[PDB]
Design a protein around this ligand. Structure first.
Ligand SMILES: NC(=O)c1ccc[n+]([C@@H]2O[C@H](COP(=O)([O-])OP(=O)(O)OC[C@H]3O[C@@H](n4cnc5c(N)ncnc54)[C@H](O)[C@@H]3O)[C@@H](O)[C@H]2O)c1
Ligand SMILES: NC(=O)c1ccc[n+]([C@@H]2O[C@H](COP(=O)([O-])OP(=O)(O)OC[C@H]3O[C@@H](n4cnc5c(N)ncnc54)[C@H](O)[C@@H]3O)[C@@H](O)[C@H]2O)c1
Lengths: 489, 489, 489, 489
């Protein structure tokens, strides 16, 4: 096991433009606090519109025809991404420590989940750089028609606080492998791993201006990015409300292309013929992983009437044994909730459950008067019209609903405006394939949960997003198609 | 040559929902007028939000799982599209006459160009129905991972007045070949061919509610479609200003996926080593086709200094010989402009050209003071700062600019916020390929103009659009990617 | 139901070259007999090496650059294949009658199976003609690299007697959609449907020489095709022994490319959790369809010990109720075996079963002293080392083997040098996917049998073949890849 | 520049099976000699059929389901290939010195050309391992149809003496990225780099038996591989005559799939409008690279009459200045020929050129009567009927032919039974594209020569080969297509 770094000193706190470190134009700074201790970690430069303008101009200059970045052969862009993945692997303990300091997630989770995802995503997209191919199209005997899959240009990336470095790498890996340049804005709550990655980008050998990073607030830096007349594309991960604002500002300004990865109201469907212990364990991790603060969280667990009581009973036994505490401690599986606004949000919904007719089975309150920890809560007798089944709790609350037929559970699972993920538990071939085809979700897991791969696309149907991240499909978000049609005389 | 139908009676004027004809909920109607005779053709039902709600509900019912449309095997949707193409071919003369009546374009142009494009586009996408394939993705030894390219659902289509049936078919062909259902809104100026197509959809055997058509105005029907919470996707062709409104309404409502095909400020670059006579004929047709009312029209004809004077001279001869008149006459190459608003706007730009210093070579005024005809106009000595070089004229005006170097003409050609098409005329291999690569345009034509194929994608860079129409690329706009990941026990 | 044509007169009996009908150069003819009556149907021209040379020269002239066939736009080749499918549909009753006359298969089977497959294959490949796309490959900043998927040239097609027209269309549809020209050789036992198709090829409008047909014997016409120095590719369907000879002669002569579709020793695997009645019915059709004379025939039915006796019992009940008789009679599900050599081959293997320890359950002898009919036979207690489990019977004999575990049945099912098809029956998701991944077969059917689609590839692993027919994969057999690499100065 | 290793000791001389070194079963050894010093380098174990049987059994065991190699996740096979490339880069100087010792090619050519190709090819295919994707195919509403691109199994590789390590890596890289196991046979003249690669395969961490190497002769080891009943695929690079033998042995044994990369009679077409100095330099390197012992060598340099005399003149100056000598010297551009047999064959062709009427411009004899060096030879006034224009010389001889029209040079260039490569030199767009389309060659270079990329396929038309190496196309040669069709109840 890797050794925890409980007293790490943050070295990168400035704006990264043209492979150099800058103070904010205004001189302003903001603090980042550790969610576990509530103490301040350091001050970071606070970017605003003038810093975004400087970053966008550097990105435009690095993308211009004839630039060192544009002149690189396709395989050399792949080599640079592999060199960046080598550095991320070398500095893995430090990156995971900065992520634990900023988010409060357990060190071993940051090391084995977040950082593993970063390295695998970088290596996967490094291999696509010389494999981005257009088409030769047959038309007429005297015509040569073909398509070029060109880089779009300057790409803005806006990410959230729950998986800071990972959500940034899901955009940076395909963007760079396609030949674009970038302006990144990490969440104000979690700027540290992004700034450290800036140092590795320069060390890997990327030409100045290919990646620029401006820390700051959403309505200031984020809005300057979404409305910028010289940013050609934006990729956003975060809340549905902010995703709508970003896509609106992008449309209002220069019609820049927009990828959105938003929340969900993700269902779990457990059939009577499932391996019940597998379904209980997967639905447990689905609800309680990352303190419930994950876009993939299960918000509705639909269980067939035949196994309903036994599923509730075994779920209650699993929720009580979860170790909660200090993130840097090896035994810890659940750290604190990011902030007071999140901790109070989760606490307010549990009361509505008991008042609407649902039976509280376990938990239902905060852990202790010291940190932002909440007790794993399970609810039975949940119905569709209830608040705990209609709203994204983003906390450790497991609502268990009952169903009788496949057709009925398909209608209920799809009765939401969201569609990010779904998980089905059954040993039956026909039920598994029928549910996988019928569920309106970007990813359908069968007999598993949270099984992500750099090679498999991920994203939402309906209001859970626009576009896909990961897989070959991610490349379509970072390229522009040009048709060249030549008529021979 | 097909005989001109100079006195056709219009049979289809109503709202088309569930394969039936309906009066508008308000009882209101709007007139459609022939721009050549300036007489009213007929009155069409004027839809509003209640009519759109009824059409979306029909499209939703036709799309629900288990419906006749959803149960059709892939090859059967292709058969339906070929049966529609056969009906469009059978009624080709009537559709072309309806298009000439509504738009003023010559009857032989609507017959051999617009209608040929419709038939070719329907047959091309009919062949894609059983060829839309997802992927099987290698992951781990105990995992089966694959993607499904599912239909998105209810698709809205909003089209302009310059190529009414064709812009509609460009959306309808891929949408239906992917298994979607639709709500169509033709332009208020040109509703006739869309309504006639509705009668062909019912005769072709499409189940009720697969295609619904609501004629009406933009801020009423169009805005009800763009903001609808049960429309999953919208494809829009029209002005950049309205495209922005549609995309903002889409983001604000339900994050429906959006395709935009907007205007351009398209450059046509004529090098000194070009086949000069081919470049003159192509740039002439490229400016003057469809009365200059084409999104592909050359807004800037850049000619190298070495051939500038002879290019201008030969272009004037072409412009002076272009037969302008009654669109139903066999000799007519140019009919009237669409309406008074467009006619006055073109005349305003012609006066601005004179007042800013451009040399008027020919035309420069209306034909015979009464009709909506404008004399084919050529301006030489045009510079980049002039209005006739910056603004999309959408009329029969050819502005000829001079250039000296390839690097300079690339900079000038790309200095626009648009990027729909570009054309290059040169006999040199290196010049042609360097220009094809450097021009920021969705289609680059070399030694040809307006060379479109159902199999070659078309769309804009920058503010000329998002997404592509035609080719295999059109399918990505009408399908939603689903990852199914199965872990074997 | 379509009316049978019990007294049809054959009109096409000559060699088809350059869209004209020719006598053989030698003047020789051969007879074709009806397998049901044993009577002679007609005499057909007997081609030899001089007729093949004439056919190959016509095919070469039709394929030369600048020819009408080579000049056709991609979409027009698709239109020709659709016109040929329209004619095949129009003349469906006549084609099915000629196939029943030549093969002895029931008229309704020829009409609803063979002819349906022909029409679907033609329509599917008609849609690929304008969708055969190569790639644009990223290399260096100063290089333009792309691939062309060109037609190979003159394609020879050699087919067998069991599905005459269908096996020919599986080659002709992709070959023509890719732009090649052809020399066809149907089996000497079944020349009629191929010659009738020649008349429809000319009527559809294919230029002369694009398709040429030379009836005759294998060692004469077939060998002249496989060894021809001006045939660029051959596709062969038939016995493994003849497939090896064709591939050897192709290699010895000019290294022409070869696709082979050969026999199999196809397994059926029925798990204890299968829908037993579905498994019994599918394995019945698998063994007894087309009198057992099908490349997809099940030669080994592996049944899990838990359902073994019940599977044998229900299989015996199904085999006794099969209606055998006159092919043109509506109630007939089984006609006669093609010839005496086939009828005697099936009769000799049943004796070996009883002598090696297998229990005969039903049948085991000829039907009656009048025609070439054999009684549906079922064997239980079959082992791997027995002759009825090791040899392709090509007749109505169902050997039922017993198994205990999945790992064991995978090893046994794969212990053959063949690998054409396999079928698995189970309600369990994991067993279905594990068996589908582990079985070394070109097609794995799950809970079905003989489910072919024009869009799904078909072909063998190991000695069951080389290459694939059907699906997008068929196009790779009929195209040659050319890389064009251009360096810009 | 890397320092030349003039006195390297060879460590690896044994048969490599299961990551261990073995003496031959017979105890026999064969010598390898340095063509520059004409002294023996070392003795290598001489394999025969017993050694091949042991290597195939190891490859089969390494390929069986459940083996460590088969259980590796897709991304892990890519990591192994990158680790092998890192080891080839680390030992680049030693591999290049071993290649120079065995072949006589200049040390800097083996270092910057052969070894660079090896590393680039390994890294390109390492990136394909997690990107080999099959398809999900739409069929019927109740059917799930998909393809898997499975590894073929045991692959044999037989390579020639002119680019020993590179031709091996071209097969090894895609074979292992697809999950296959291998038996390799390097040429008897050049076994050293293949055996050194074996030590790198074991050090890289490949499980035992994934790669096995059996040095030896063609009719013994090579024929045992081509005829082996447990080898599923063979890739061969070498002469057309031996390729025919291998393909016939493959057909006669088990129908193993075959790839052939054979010789060519490659045309190099220089138009009057070419950049003459570029065409002279390219055609010079294209004939003389690797002592003229390249499959890509121009066998016919066709020059348009307008520039014929000046082309000949400038080519003579290049040929006279080419430094011939000790391959380890930095200035050397041409080493000795491979052996006495090749050396005498080249001298025989040079005499035949003189006796048939070609004008000897320079060279025409051995360098200094003792060594295997031949003076760079240029012949003008060459005609199509001459031996030096029909036969693959495989030596430093440039035959320059004259042409007058494009149509005539297309006919003459395509009149061969071969079709590996072609090169065209012209500044005209139409001429370049018309020639690229009309030349029957697997690779057509325009204004360049020997421009190979790991991402661009390479292979022959006609008798120059079957299949492609490099690019995405290489994967189709190392995978077997499986259709899985599931019918839902
Ligand atoms: N893969 C995914 O779909 C995915 C992954 C992680 C998180 N999320 C979602 O993230 C949400 C919570 O994250 P959060 O609280 O950081 O969300 P948030 O939407 O408030 O902020 C996300 C980012 O947007 C910026 N931002 C805020 N207002 C802005 C504005 N007006 N214009 C531009 N940028 C602005 C923020 O500074 C931050 O960088 C959850 O709903 C969760 O489902 C989704
Ligand atoms: N899809 C498939 O894989 C498929 C389909 C149908 C039939 N088959 C196989 O067909 C076999 C029986 O068919 P058949 O009896 O017609 O087989 P066959 O191999 O004897 O003859 C097939 C064809 O090859 C020709 N031929 C024979 N000898 C030749 C030679 N020396 N050179 C060239 N051509 C020659 C014949 O005239 C005929 O046209 C079975 O084993 C069955 O599995 C396979």
């Amino acid at each position: 096991l890797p050794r925890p770094i409980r007293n790490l000193e943050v070295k990168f706190t400035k704006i990264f433009i043209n492979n150099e470190w800058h103070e904010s134009k205004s001189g302003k700074k903001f603090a980042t606090c550790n969610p576990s201790t509530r103490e301040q970690i350091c001050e970071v430069e606070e970017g605003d519109k003038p810093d975004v303008d400087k970053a966008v101009e550097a990105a435009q200059v690095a993308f211009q025809r004839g630039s060192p970045w544009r002149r690189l052969d396709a395989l050399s862009r792949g080599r640079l991404l592999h060199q960046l993945a080598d550095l991320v692997e070398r500095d893995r303990a430090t990156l995971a420590a900065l992520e634990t300091m900023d988010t409060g997630k357990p060190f071993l989770h940051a090391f084995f989940i977040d950082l593993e995802g970063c390295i695998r995503t970088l290596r996967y997209f490094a291999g696509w750089a010389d494999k981005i191919q257009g088409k030769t199209i047959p038309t007429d005997d005297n015509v040569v028609c073909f398509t070029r899959h060109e880089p779009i240009g300057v790409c803005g990336a806006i990410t959230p606080w729950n998986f800071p470095l990972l959500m940034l790498v899901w955009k940076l890996a395909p963007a760079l492998c396609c030949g674009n340049t970038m302006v990144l804005k990490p969440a104000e709550q979690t700027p540290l791993t992004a700034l450290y990655l800036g140092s590795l980008i320069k060390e890997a050998g990327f030409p100045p201006g290919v990646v620029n990073i401006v820390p700051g607030f959403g309505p200031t830096v984020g809005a300057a990015i979404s409305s910028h007349p010289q940013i050609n594309k934006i990729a956003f991960t975060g809340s549905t409300e902010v995703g709508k604002l970003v896509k609106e500002a992008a449309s209002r300004s220069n019609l820049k292309r927009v990828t959105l990865e938003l929340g969900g109201k993700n269902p779990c469907i457990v059939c009577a013929d499932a391996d019940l212990d597998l379904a209980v364990e997967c639905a447990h991790q689905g609800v309680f992983f990352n303190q419930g603060q994950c876009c993939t969280a299960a918000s509705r667990v639909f269980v067939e009437e035949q196994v309903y009581s036994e599923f509730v009973r075994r779920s209650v036994e699993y929720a009580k044994k979860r170790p909660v505490g200090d993130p840097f401690d090896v035994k810890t599986e659940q750290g604190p909730q990011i902030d007071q606004k999140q901790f109070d949000k989760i606490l307010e919904l549990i009361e509505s459950g008991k008042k609407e007719g649902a039976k509280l089975e376990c938990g239902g309150s905060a852990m202790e008067d010291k940190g932002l920890f909440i007790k794993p809560t399970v609810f039975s007798e949940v119905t569709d019209n209830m608040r705990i089944a209609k709203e994204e709790i983003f906390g450790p609350v497991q609502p268990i609903l009952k169903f009788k037929s496949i057709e009925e559970v398909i209608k209920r699972a799809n009765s939401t405006d969201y569609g990010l993920t779904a998980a089905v538990f059954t040993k039956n071939l026909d039920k598994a394939l029928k549910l996988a085809s019928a569920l309106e979700s970007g990813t359908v897991w069968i007999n598993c949960y949270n099984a992500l791969y750099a090679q498999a696309p991920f994203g939402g149907f309906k209001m859970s997003g626009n576009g896909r991240e990961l897989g070959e499909y991610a490349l379509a978000e970072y390229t522009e198609v040009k048709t060249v049609t030549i008529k021979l005389g």
